[PDB]
Symmetry: D2
Subunit: 418 residues, 4 copies
Amino acid sequence: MEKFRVIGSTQPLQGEVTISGAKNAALPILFASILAEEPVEVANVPHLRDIDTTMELLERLGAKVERNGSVHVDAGPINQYCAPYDLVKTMRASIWALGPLVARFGQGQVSLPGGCAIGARPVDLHIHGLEQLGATITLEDGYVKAHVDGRLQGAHIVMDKVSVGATITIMCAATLAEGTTVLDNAAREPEIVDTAMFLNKLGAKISGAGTDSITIEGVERLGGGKHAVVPDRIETGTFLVAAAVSRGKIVCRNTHAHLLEAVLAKLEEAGAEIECGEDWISLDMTGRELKAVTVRTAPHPGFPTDMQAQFTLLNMMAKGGGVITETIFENRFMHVPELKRMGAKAEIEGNTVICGDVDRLSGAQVMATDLRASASLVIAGCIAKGETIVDRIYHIDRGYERIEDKLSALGANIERFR
Amino acid sequence: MEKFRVIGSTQPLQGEVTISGAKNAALPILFASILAEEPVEVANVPHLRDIDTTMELLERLGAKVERNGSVHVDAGPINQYCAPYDLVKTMRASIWALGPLVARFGQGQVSLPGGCAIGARPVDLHIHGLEQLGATITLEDGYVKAHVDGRLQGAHIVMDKVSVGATITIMCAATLAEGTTVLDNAAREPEIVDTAMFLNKLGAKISGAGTDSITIEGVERLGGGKHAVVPDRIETGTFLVAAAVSRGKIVCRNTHAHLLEAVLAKLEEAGAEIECGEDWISLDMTGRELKAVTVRTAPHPGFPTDMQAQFTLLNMMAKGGGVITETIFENRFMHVPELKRMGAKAEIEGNTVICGDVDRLSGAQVMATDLRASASLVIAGCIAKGETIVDRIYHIDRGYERIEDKLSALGANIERFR
Amino acid sequence: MEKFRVIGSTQPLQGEVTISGAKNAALPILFASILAEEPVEVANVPHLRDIDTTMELLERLGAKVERNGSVHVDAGPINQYCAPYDLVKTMRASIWALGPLVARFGQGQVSLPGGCAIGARPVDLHIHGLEQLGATITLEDGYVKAHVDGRLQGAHIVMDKVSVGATITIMCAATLAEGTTVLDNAAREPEIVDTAMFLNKLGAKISGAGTDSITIEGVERLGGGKHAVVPDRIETGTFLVAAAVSRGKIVCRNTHAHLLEAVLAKLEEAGAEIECGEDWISLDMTGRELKAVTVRTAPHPGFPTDMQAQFTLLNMMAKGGGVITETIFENRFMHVPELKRMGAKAEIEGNTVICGDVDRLSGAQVMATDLRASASLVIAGCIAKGETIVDRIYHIDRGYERIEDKLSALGANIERFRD
Amino acid sequence: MEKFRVIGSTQPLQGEVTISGAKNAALPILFASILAEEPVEVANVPHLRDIDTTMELLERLGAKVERNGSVHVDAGPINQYCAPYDLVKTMRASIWALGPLVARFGQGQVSLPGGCAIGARPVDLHIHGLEQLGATITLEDGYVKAHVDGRLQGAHIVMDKVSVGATITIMCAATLAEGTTVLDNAAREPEIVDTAMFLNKLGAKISGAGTDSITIEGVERLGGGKHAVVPDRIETGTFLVAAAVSRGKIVCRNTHAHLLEAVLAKLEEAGAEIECGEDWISLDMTGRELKAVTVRTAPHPGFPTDMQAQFTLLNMMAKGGGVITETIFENRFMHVPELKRMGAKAEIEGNTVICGDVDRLSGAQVMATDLRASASLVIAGCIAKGETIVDRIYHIDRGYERIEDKLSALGANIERFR
Ligand SMILES: CC(=O)N[C@H]1[C@@H](OP(=O)(O)OP(=O)(O)OC[C@H]2O[C@@H](n3ccc(=O)[nH]c3=O)[C@H](O)[C@@H]2O)O[C@H](CO)[C@@H](O)[C@@H]1O
Ligand SMILES: CC(=O)N[C@H]1[C@@H](OP(=O)(O)OP(=O)(O)OC[C@H]2O[C@@H](n3ccc(=O)[nH]c3=O)[C@H](O)[C@@H]2O)O[C@H](CO)[C@@H](O)[C@@H]1O
Ligand SMILES: CC(=O)N[C@H]1[C@@H](OP(=O)(O)OP(=O)(O)OC[C@H]2O[C@@H](n3ccc(=O)[nH]c3=O)[C@H](O)[C@@H]2O)O[C@H](CO)[C@@H](O)[C@@H]1O
Ligand SMILES: CC(=O)N[C@H]1[C@@H](OP(=O)(O)OP(=O)(O)OC[C@H]2O[C@@H](n3ccc(=O)[nH]c3=O)[C@H](O)[C@@H]2O)O[C@H](CO)[C@@H](O)[C@@H]1O
Ligand SMILES: *[C@H](C)[C@H](O)P(=O)(O)O
Ligand SMILES: *[C@H](C)[C@H](O)P(=O)(O)O
Ligand SMILES: *[C@H](C)[C@H](O)P(=O)(O)O
Ligand SMILES: *[C@H](C)[C@H](O)P(=O)(O)O
Ligand code: NA
Ligand code: NA
Ligand code: NA
Ligand code: NA
Ligand code: NA
């Protein structure tokens, strides 16, 4: 198991960082490419483990896949329709293959994702969504087995809850259904907007993406095309926090303020000065005193739960307390007892963390548990005093491309080892 | 203390009900008219106590007010700026007086509302939204005291949580600020749309209302005009549920399905046949079995917390159990133990009620506690066996207009008495 | 509708206060006397609205009832078996009438309590506990109708949750059942112990009260007798909070520390010097810095939920934050938005209050919603700057005896008034 | 990693099983023996990973240790005082080393445990209680470092909350203090009672163990002795559920009903025939109808949280719903989504699972995440239709001795493989 050895410092993290394509846009785009009958190019895809898994999954369906900067996909010759346990237990996102498969081939099988470290994370909304589009779905031997005689049919659908994943499953499958689909109470996340933009280039007709009502007019087939994935707003916030919490000064390139206004306002409120350009965001925390903030996770454009662990660390270092309420997932405070091992002060109650204030963390051996928690611990390591060992660092590589290099270019002292 | 004596019946409720203007659009529109220098007419306003309290409150500022079908307001000669405790303790919506006063006159005092039966209901967002428009705000003798030297200044504001009230405060006040305001993560409720249509008729420049990003270009003054208040989606919901739970058959006039797509979909799922027209909605339940649903309250267009009490009842009488989860207010199951007095089966756990199934309620003396719970008890009274006395019915009059007359036309047996 | 006009001061509250008998012991014991075939005298009973309500409820069953220092009760000639809606809507402890009546007479009807301000407060455990003693129970037109053909039958009962009320129902009712009952996971509140002491004087055979396992050996009947009610630990805590929060000095007479060790340790943790005698407790906070504390309400001997609102105020005036977590009742933070009107700082999330720090509160008009919140507002009145009007003050009289007079003896400026 | 291959059947699980000594007794007793200057012998100790790890902990302090039926410990020559990271990350109960060490040697160091999967599990109450006995405690490099100049000082302590672990820590440490200690609001779990019996045989002076006030009079030193560990009530509960959920008939030996009255009563309420002897409990579910039940977890003698996963399975197979509220640990529902893979039906909200009804589960591949979930998954494997693979089965050996053997003796078809 790979680990990070991090040697901390009161040195501010400063410099520049090039922000990669969004993990959470590139995934649903690549799964959406199953619908396409012609070759497809997806530019600005980061190198992550979840993309290798996704790439392998498409290969195992009969698609031809190749990558470096872009990923090229020829989904034309797809002639298998299963996403097996072996891969799904690796990556629950695999659920996204069920919609495109049934919609294009009338058939689809996908291992039901078991339990996630951050929550039970059921998929009822995906299932009920495709059923509403005319599919028949069962569970046999732990596989969600879906099928429809003919084409899926357009329907008016109102989501019980706001769900990113399910909004996508339904929107994507609806592109090849007969007639028109109106999905109400959809999620507004910008990766949804990007997945629609991509599909529309292939010959789909999706309108209202990024509003709570999405209209999809079904077409008989989708073609080919090129698309550059939207920048990663979470990677972006992650580095801004890294600068904020170290009295630092950083500019993020190839990223856009409109993707993360809630985070940018919270960072301004915690003391930072923020500037924005055509395609960059800068943060200056030099000579500014870090102040605690109150936070409530919520659907976009509210505060994203993917920034929650990073702001737990911020508040732990910020004077004036700091309270974080997590509404989205039920078990996403696993970073707290780890940070406590480094001398951090906080208390948990239901869905809320109440942070104390601490001048400086102490290096210690800690263990990553999930993707965003993992990053917070590495940042903690950078500012702490002495040597930090972050075990199980493969979690980071699921969502950050070569984070040790990116942070090293900012003055961090990080070693990847076995 | 007025009461309702209801004699229940197995007879399904049938007929027509004419839906009134939305209470929650009428109110902010009325408070918004404080910004107007010229006479205003607000049509399609229901007769509720809360609208009387709002009228009394404008009178006390120096406005000229009168009504019957419409409400007529001349806020030109206003020369006092305090909303006093004796009225605010009656109706917390009075905080809406603060923003217009300070925006137009540079000054405002409103009594800080105390505890609500359904929740703590703080107004921290209203105060902090106004502070970002450049107002200086104190609390003194229980009065939220706001002031600004000159005009408020437009700003970029990102809401910390979704709030209907706070969104309104900020939008209305920004219509007279110098420069442009952008309000992100605003509430999307349809009463916000209405208020904004109203304000634009007076010379305001508000775009994006009904989306999560509201842009307001400030103007130096607003003039006069005439506006008709959007129909009440909650009152619509309430009668649709009455029909459904008595296995009956109704049509609601002067309403629009697009105001309540979440409610209509749960009524369909529960078994009801629903048709919609240009300005009407019907529900037919005759010879259809009532089926339990799970519901989760959320901000519009999700399932409204103002429909939750009524849907508790529906589940209590429906087969298959039913689960209602309330995310918005922390204490809105006060109806449950009073319904249990009538023989209902339910268990509360945290923010969730788990309903059993019951064939028919039994009449009993019960007590209304809040507006929406009140109507649930009344509906319950109509289907129960024997006589139900609902104490403290003045709550119903705050939000429904002569509901004993509307239900009477549908065949209910209801007496108002002391 | 009565109010208090409180005028605040920085002068610490100082002096003595004589603790009355526990309301929450007085009540079960009076409902318990329904079992008694002959005269009973209950000493050390406070003068409260809830006791007046209990005495009328007893009268309406056919008991003969008088009071002043004590309450005298002859339950011998009881001839009716209904607790009517008009009384239960007033006081939900009226549910305790169900078990004695069914146990002694084979029958009892009691109106099913509605919603309470502080939580839904179902009574399913009382009912189920009585069903398991052999009773048949139905809900008919809002009334809990219980009957049994003959005497109740002892049973081994394991409580699904800890409930003060239900433990008492089952305990009392069991004293006239045939054979032996063992109640497990029983509440251990001292008011249960005192009710058990009371019943045993009348010829009952209750053992293990105050532990999690209570054995009741049923008897055929119960005599009469005399009992002085245990001190009120909540009133005790409430005055000790008053001294502490006013940076003052107090001694409470006719009370015992062993009733509230959890409150005392938190008061010491808040920075107070506390001393105890055989029947008194003193607190001195003079020259001392009030420090915030974290609290988790929990069954006795844990931190009592009835002290929560008062400790909410304590933490709001204390430095260092302060976190209060309520695990018992679901909606018991109504005092918070009212204290906010007086300038307090706190935020609520779920079952937890996170308190800020404030040097001095500010007088304002405020509304009592419940008994314990009522007292916290009064105490806040005493230390705030200026005048405070506490509306709907009748709540306080449900559980405190002439509280304005007790506070006035300490230095407070309080006026009960109308209109 | 070892796995179980289970092949399910409708065959009822029937026969006998011998209950071992309680895991949760044997551990605190073996940590308690750090106090003793003379050899100690602890009989009826189960063969479990956690007991190997404890024996290793003890040796590393310099104690002499053998086992098989019993564990022998000679703590006399202890010359070291650290519980290192490499052991604590394996088993957080190593915290119980801290108290005995500082009590006996004036010094102790223990790695601050990180996150547990079932909750954050802080240890604040152990620290604050040892400080109240006169210890000075610090956090340094992730180690809890305790020390006192001389002997500990008996104190009057009220626990902020009920904690099994801290109760024991404070109780054990107090046996060597100068003077008397009174631990109010103490935990009452029978494993505390057992530990105190063990200590009094060595010369300690503990009384009240079993109630909420424990009085310990300090002595100078403690000698040696023999003690048979109390039967495991959770292992007992677990086999009783296995029979109940299989329409089965079982008798458990070397166990006592008074250890688990809460569980027996819910089993009876579920429709099972229970009978109890001097040292046995039997359950007969043959030809009986399994009925759902409600459970609220709570401190002993309430319903134990270590039975909650098993009772989740039970209610999932029982008719009439089933609600389970967990009030002790904040993330103890990880079995749920894994059972869903097997066709189980249930939803979760906050601290509560709302169970549906299923006639028979479907074999699938599933993942154990903790001790009690692990066992519930194996039992589900025995009653499901088809083949079930439970991965990461080492979890189960942390607390159940040779469970595949105990279950085969009841009819089951289980295979341990790699
Ligand atoms: C795009 C991606 O690869 N993963 C992201 C995606 O996860 P994901 O799409 O799983 O997140 P969702 O918005 O679907 O889920 C949010 C909440 O809704 C619940 N829910 C969801 C579906 C369902 O059928 N039933 C149900 O109850 C989930 O358990 C969770 O409690 O959005 C999350 C919300 O920002 C991000 O944190 C994840 O990083
Ligand atoms: C229009 C009107 O007269 N009343 C409606 C309005 O109330 P209202 O405008 O009060 O509702 P909000 O959306 O503002 O409140 C929603 C949640 O946000 C919280 N919050 C609100 C303001 C604030 O400054 N801080 C804060 O934390 C509230 O306590 C609540 O828990 O919207 C509610 C939600 O649809 C409706 O049920 C009410 O019937
Ligand atoms: C007259 C009297 O002595 N009143 C006290 C008594 O009230 P009371 O006896 O009502 O309080 P309980 O101990 O019964 O209630 C504890 C918890 O159990 C729940 N519950 C209770 C009974 C039941 O049948 N089902 C059920 O679910 C309640 O809703 C509550 O959440 O104890 C409370 C808790 O210490 C004190 O605050 C009250 O001042
Ligand atoms: C080795 C052992 O005997 N383990 C058992 C023991 O664990 P353990 O002794 O760790 O359990 P505790 O009773 O201490 O913990 C109960 C609750 O208190 C909290 N807490 C605990 C200690 C502390 O210092 N601060 C704090 O907040 C925990 O988060 C938990 O939510 O009791 C549990 C409760 O039945 C059982 O499930 C475990 O199997
Ligand atoms: C953990 C985050 C989930 O189970 P995965 O499928 O995304 O790994
Ligand atoms: C209850 C709904 C609130 O407290 P009000 O101010 O509207 O009376
Ligand atoms: C409120 C405290 C309850 O409903 P009561 O019966 O004591 O008035
Ligand atoms: C999980 C059960 C805890 O971390 P452990 O230390 O007992 O493994
Ligand atoms: Na902080
Ligand atoms: Na139902
Ligand atoms: Na404080
Ligand atoms: Na609540
Ligand atoms: Na079930």
